C-alpha cells in the first residue's frame, strides 16, 4: 500500500537507544546533571514530535524537554559556530571550561542525529523525514535546533566567540542559525563583544578574510545592537589548537 515519502533522510537507526544512551553517558561525567531522569528526558523528547505531522512542529513542543534539560553554563564561556563544528568541538576538548551548544546535555543528545514521526501513531519514521527546503521548515529537527540555539545564545555574556566557515561563498550567512537566530538574541546588557574567528580552508590564498563584505555585514548587525565587534583569522586550525592555552608566548 501507500506510505508517505519525504525528501530528507529518515530517522537515524537506533535513535531511541542512542538518545537514551547519550543521556546516561552525559549525566555520568557531568555531576551537575547527575540526577536527571534519562527516561523522562527521552519521554519528553519523543513526546515533542511523535503522533504529530512532521510539519506541524512548533517550539512549544520541545518546551517539556527544555525544562528537563535545563542547563545554564557560565555565560562567559560560550563558543558559537556556523556551518562547520569540527574545530569548535576540538577547541572545547582543549579549552575544557568552554561550551558549544553540543557540549550541553540538549545539544549533546541530538548532535548528528535526524528524527521525525507521523500523525496519529507513535511510529518513528526511519525511511524519510521532511527536507527544510523541499517539504517544510517546521520539521522536528529544524524546530529543535532553532529553539535550543536561541536559548543557549541569549543567555551568553561578556565576550561571545563565533567560528565561521571561511571557505564558503558567504563566510557570514544571515540565513544560518547563527545569522538568523543567535546573533539577534545576544543581549547588550550582558554581552560586551562578539568576536568572529574565521576558519581558513585550503583555497583561501592566505587572504585577510576579516575584510570580507559578509564580515562587514555581521559587524553592522552587531553594532546596531550596541555590541562591540572583533574579527580574527584562523589560518591554520592545528596551529590554533596548539596555541589555545598559551596564545601570547
Ligand atoms: N549541532 C547542530 O547540528 C546544530 C544545528 C543547528 C544549529 N546549531 C547551533 O547553531 C549554530 C550553527 O548553526 P548554523 O550552521 O546554521 O549557523 C551553532 O552555534 C550551533 O550550536 C547546531
Coordinates of N, CA and C in Angstrom, one line a residue, residues 43-172:
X43 N 11.3 10.4 27.1 CA 9.8 10.5 27.0 C 9.4 11.9 26.6
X44 N 10.0 12.9 27.1 CA 9.8 14.3 26.7 C 10.2 14.7 25.3
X45 N 11.4 14.2 24.9 CA 12.0 14.3 23.6 C 11.0 13.7 22.5
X46 N 10.7 12.4 22.7 CA 9.8 11.7 21.9 C 8.4 12.4 21.8
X47 N 7.9 12.8 23.0 CA 6.6 13.5 23.0 C 6.5 14.8 22.3
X48 N 7.6 15.3 21.9 CA 7.7 16.6 21.2 C 7.2 16.4 19.7
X49 N 7.4 15.2 19.2 CA 7.2 15.0 17.7 C 6.5 13.8 17.3
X50 N 6.4 12.7 18.2 CA 5.7 11.5 17.8 C 4.2 11.8 17.8
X51 N 3.4 11.1 16.9 CA 2.0 11.3 16.8 C 1.6 12.6 16.1
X52 N 2.6 13.4 15.7 CA 2.4 14.7 15.1 C 2.8 14.6 13.6
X53 N 2.1 15.3 12.7 CA 2.5 15.5 11.4 C 3.9 16.2 11.5
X54 N 4.9 15.8 10.8 CA 6.2 16.3 11.0 C 6.4 17.7 10.4
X55 N 5.4 18.4 9.9 CA 5.4 19.8 9.5 C 4.5 20.6 10.5
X56 N 4.0 20.0 11.5 CA 3.2 20.6 12.5 C 3.9 20.7 13.8
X57 N 5.2 20.8 13.8 CA 6.0 21.0 15.0 C 6.3 22.5 15.3
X58 N 6.1 22.9 16.5 CA 6.4 24.3 16.9 C 7.4 24.2 18.1
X59 N 8.0 25.4 18.4 CA 9.0 25.5 19.5 C 8.4 25.0 20.9
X60 N 7.1 25.3 21.1 CA 6.4 24.9 22.3 C 6.4 23.3 22.5
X61 N 6.5 22.6 21.4 CA 6.5 21.1 21.5 C 7.8 20.6 22.3
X62 N 8.9 21.4 22.2 CA 10.1 21.0 22.9 C 10.3 21.6 24.3
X63 N 9.3 22.4 24.7 CA 9.4 23.1 26.0 C 9.5 22.1 27.2
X64 N 8.7 20.9 27.1 CA 8.9 20.0 28.2 C 10.3 19.4 28.3
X65 N 10.9 19.1 27.1 CA 12.3 18.6 27.0 C 13.3 19.7 27.6
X66 N 13.1 20.9 27.1 CA 13.9 22.1 27.5 C 14.0 22.2 29.0
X67 N 12.9 22.1 29.7 CA 12.8 22.2 31.1 C 13.5 21.1 31.9
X68 N 13.4 19.9 31.4 CA 14.2 18.7 31.9 C 15.7 18.8 31.7
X69 N 16.1 19.4 30.6 CA 17.5 19.5 30.2 C 18.0 20.9 30.5
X70 N 17.3 21.7 31.4 CA 17.8 23.0 31.8 C 19.2 22.9 32.3
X71 N 20.0 23.8 31.7 CA 21.4 23.9 32.0 C 21.9 25.2 31.6
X72 N 22.4 26.0 32.5 CA 22.9 27.3 32.3 C 24.3 27.4 32.6
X73 N 25.2 27.1 31.7 CA 26.7 27.1 31.9 C 27.2 28.5 32.1
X74 N 28.4 28.7 32.6 CA 28.9 30.0 32.7 C 28.8 30.8 31.4
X75 N 28.0 31.9 31.4 CA 27.7 32.7 30.2 C 28.9 33.3 29.5
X76 N 30.0 33.4 30.2 CA 31.2 33.9 29.6 C 32.1 32.9 29.0
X77 N 31.6 31.6 28.8 CA 32.4 30.5 28.3 C 31.7 29.9 27.1
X78 N 31.0 30.7 26.3 CA 30.2 30.2 25.2 C 31.0 30.3 23.9
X79 N 31.0 29.2 23.1 CA 31.5 29.3 21.7 C 30.4 28.9 20.8
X80 N 30.1 29.9 19.9 CA 29.2 29.6 18.8 C 29.9 29.3 17.5
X81 N 29.2 28.7 16.5 CA 29.8 28.4 15.2 C 28.8 28.5 14.1
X82 N 29.2 28.5 12.9 CA 28.3 28.5 11.8 C 28.9 27.6 10.6
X83 N 28.0 26.7 10.1 CA 28.3 25.8 9.1 C 29.3 24.6 9.5
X84 N 30.4 24.9 10.0 CA 31.4 23.9 10.5 C 31.6 23.9 12.0
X85 N 31.6 22.7 12.6 CA 31.6 22.5 14.0 C 32.8 21.7 14.5
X86 N 33.5 21.0 13.6 CA 34.6 20.1 13.9 C 35.7 20.8 14.7
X87 N 36.1 22.0 14.3 CA 37.2 22.8 15.0 C 36.6 23.3 16.3
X88 N 35.4 23.7 16.3 CA 34.7 24.2 17.6 C 34.7 23.2 18.7
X89 N 34.3 21.9 18.3 CA 34.3 20.8 19.2 C 35.7 20.4 19.7
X90 N 36.7 20.4 18.7 CA 38.1 20.2 19.1 C 38.6 21.2 20.1
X91 N 38.2 22.5 19.8 CA 38.6 23.6 20.7 C 38.1 23.3 22.2
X92 N 36.8 23.0 22.3 CA 36.2 22.7 23.7 C 36.8 21.5 24.3
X93 N 37.5 20.6 23.6 CA 38.2 19.5 24.1 C 39.5 19.9 24.7
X94 N 40.1 21.0 24.1 CA 41.4 21.5 24.6 C 41.1 22.5 25.7
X95 N 40.2 23.5 25.4 CA 39.8 24.5 26.4 C 38.5 24.0 27.1
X96 N 38.7 23.2 28.1 CA 37.6 22.4 28.6 C 36.6 23.1 29.5
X97 N 36.8 24.3 29.8 CA 35.8 25.2 30.5 C 34.9 25.9 29.6
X98 N 35.1 25.8 28.3 CA 34.3 26.4 27.2 C 33.2 25.4 26.8
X99 N 32.1 26.0 26.3 CA 30.9 25.2 25.8 C 30.5 25.6 24.4
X100 N 30.3 24.7 23.5 CA 29.4 24.8 22.4 C 28.1 24.3 22.8
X101 N 27.0 24.6 22.0 CA 25.7 24.0 22.3 C 25.7 22.5 22.4
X102 N 26.6 21.9 21.6 CA 26.7 20.4 21.5 C 27.5 19.8 22.7
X103 N 28.0 20.7 23.6 CA 28.6 20.2 24.8 C 27.7 20.4 26.0
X104 N 26.5 20.9 25.8 CA 25.4 20.9 26.8 C 24.6 19.7 26.6
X105 N 23.9 19.2 27.6 CA 23.1 18.0 27.5 C 22.2 17.9 26.3
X106 N 21.4 19.0 26.1 CA 20.4 19.0 25.0 C 21.0 19.0 23.6
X107 N 22.1 19.7 23.4 CA 22.8 19.7 22.1 C 23.5 18.4 21.9
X108 N 24.1 17.8 23.0 CA 24.8 16.6 23.0 C 23.9 15.4 22.6
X109 N 22.6 15.5 23.1 CA 21.6 14.4 22.8 C 21.3 14.2 21.3
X110 N 21.3 15.3 20.6 CA 20.8 15.4 19.2 C 21.8 15.6 18.1
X111 N 23.0 16.0 18.5 CA 24.1 16.3 17.5 C 24.3 15.1 16.6
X112 N 24.2 15.4 15.3 CA 24.5 14.4 14.2 C 23.3 13.4 14.0
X113 N 22.2 13.6 14.7 CA 21.0 12.8 14.5 C 19.9 13.4 13.8
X114 N 19.1 12.6 13.2 CA 17.9 13.0 12.5 C 16.7 12.2 13.0
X115 N 15.5 12.8 13.1 CA 14.3 12.2 13.6 C 13.0 12.8 13.1
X116 N 12.0 12.0 13.1 CA 10.6 12.5 12.8 C 9.6 11.4 13.0
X117 N 8.4 11.8 13.2 CA 7.3 10.8 13.4 C 6.3 11.0 12.3
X118 N 5.0 10.7 12.6 CA 3.9 10.8 11.7 C 2.6 11.0 12.5
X119 N 1.6 11.6 11.8 CA 0.3 11.9 12.5 C -0.4 10.6 13.1
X120 N -0.9 10.8 14.3 CA -1.8 9.8 14.9 C -1.2 8.5 15.6
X121 N -0.1 8.0 15.0 CA 0.6 6.9 15.6 C 1.9 7.2 16.3
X122 N 2.4 6.3 17.1 CA 3.7 6.6 17.8 C 4.9 6.1 17.1
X123 N 4.7 5.8 15.8 CA 5.8 5.3 15.0 C 6.9 6.3 14.6
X124 N 8.1 6.0 14.8 CA 9.2 6.8 14.3 C 9.5 6.5 12.8
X125 N 9.7 7.5 12.0 CA 9.9 7.2 10.5 C 11.4 7.1 10.2
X126 N 11.8 5.9 10.0 CA 13.2 5.6 9.6 C 13.4 5.6 8.1
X127 N 12.4 5.7 7.3 CA 12.5 5.8 5.8 C 12.9 7.2 5.4
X128 N 12.1 8.2 5.8 CA 12.3 9.6 5.4 C 11.8 10.6 6.4
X129 N 12.3 11.8 6.4 CA 11.9 12.9 7.2 C 11.8 14.2 6.3
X130 N 11.0 15.2 6.6 CA 10.9 16.3 5.7 C 12.2 17.1 5.5
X131 N 12.4 17.5 4.3 CA 13.5 18.4 4.0 C 13.1 19.8 4.2
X132 N 14.0 20.6 4.8 CA 13.7 22.0 5.2 C 13.2 22.9 4.0
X133 N 13.8 22.6 2.8 CA 13.5 23.4 1.6 C 12.4 22.8 0.8
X134 N 12.4 21.5 0.6 CA 11.5 20.8 -0.4 C 10.1 20.5 0.2
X135 N 10.1 20.3 1.6 CA 8.9 19.8 2.2 C 8.3 20.8 3.2
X136 N 9.1 21.2 4.2 CA 8.7 22.2 5.2 C 9.8 22.5 6.2
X137 N 9.9 23.8 6.6 CA 10.9 24.3 7.5 C 10.5 23.9 9.0
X138 N 9.2 23.7 9.2 CA 8.7 23.4 10.6 C 8.7 21.9 10.9
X139 N 9.9 21.3 10.7 CA 10.0 19.9 10.9 C 10.7 19.6 12.3
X140 N 10.6 18.4 12.8 CA 11.1 18.1 14.2 C 12.6 18.5 14.4
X141 N 13.4 18.3 13.4 CA 14.9 18.6 13.5 C 15.1 20.1 13.5
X142 N 14.7 20.7 12.5 CA 14.9 22.2 12.3 C 14.3 23.0 13.4
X143 N 13.1 22.6 13.9 CA 12.5 23.3 15.0 C 13.2 23.1 16.3
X144 N 13.7 21.9 16.6 CA 14.5 21.6 17.7 C 15.7 22.5 17.8
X145 N 16.5 22.5 16.7 CA 17.8 23.3 16.7 C 17.5 24.8 16.8
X146 N 16.5 25.3 16.2 CA 16.1 26.7 16.3 C 15.8 27.1 17.8
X147 N 15.0 26.3 18.5 CA 14.7 26.7 19.9 C 15.9 26.5 20.9
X148 N 16.7 25.5 20.8 CA 17.8 25.3 21.7 C 19.0 26.3 21.4
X149 N 19.1 26.6 20.1 CA 20.2 27.5 19.7 C 19.9 28.9 20.2
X150 N 18.7 29.3 20.2 CA 18.3 30.6 20.8 C 18.5 30.7 22.3
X151 N 18.0 29.7 23.0 CA 18.1 29.7 24.4 C 19.5 29.7 24.9
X152 N 20.4 28.9 24.3 CA 21.8 28.9 24.5 C 22.5 30.2 24.3
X153 N 22.2 30.8 23.1 CA 22.9 32.1 22.8 C 22.4 33.3 23.6
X154 N 21.1 33.4 23.8 CA 20.5 34.5 24.5 C 21.0 34.7 26.0
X155 N 21.5 33.6 26.6 CA 22.0 33.6 27.9 C 23.5 34.0 28.0
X156 N 24.1 34.2 26.9 CA 25.6 34.5 26.8 C 25.9 35.9 27.4
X157 N 27.2 36.0 27.8 CA 27.7 37.3 28.4 C 29.1 37.5 28.1
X158 N 29.6 38.7 28.4 CA 31.0 39.2 28.2 C 31.4 39.1 26.7
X159 N 32.4 38.3 26.4 CA 32.8 38.1 25.0 C 32.2 36.8 24.5
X160 N 31.5 36.9 23.4 CA 31.0 35.7 22.7 C 31.8 35.5 21.5
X161 N 32.4 34.3 21.4 CA 33.2 33.9 20.2 C 32.3 33.1 19.3
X162 N 32.5 33.3 18.0 CA 31.9 32.5 17.0 C 32.9 32.1 15.9
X163 N 33.0 30.8 15.6 CA 33.8 30.3 14.5 C 32.9 30.3 13.2
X164 N 33.5 30.8 12.1 CA 32.8 30.9 10.8 C 33.6 30.1 9.8
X165 N 32.9 29.6 8.8 CA 33.5 28.9 7.7 C 34.0 29.8 6.6
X166 N 35.3 30.1 6.6 CA 36.0 31.0 5.6 C 36.2 30.4 4.2
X167 N 35.7 29.2 4.0 CA 35.8 28.5 2.7 C 34.5 28.7 1.8
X168 N 33.5 29.3 2.4 CA 32.2 29.4 1.8 C 32.0 30.7 1.0
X169 N 31.0 30.7 0.2 CA 30.6 32.0 -0.6 C 30.2 33.1 0.4
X170 N 29.4 32.7 1.4 CA 29.1 33.6 2.5 C 29.7 33.2 3.8
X171 N 30.9 33.8 4.1 CA 31.6 33.5 5.4 C 30.6 33.7 6.6
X172 N 30.0 34.9 6.6 CA 28.8 35.1 7.4 C 27.6 35.0 6.6

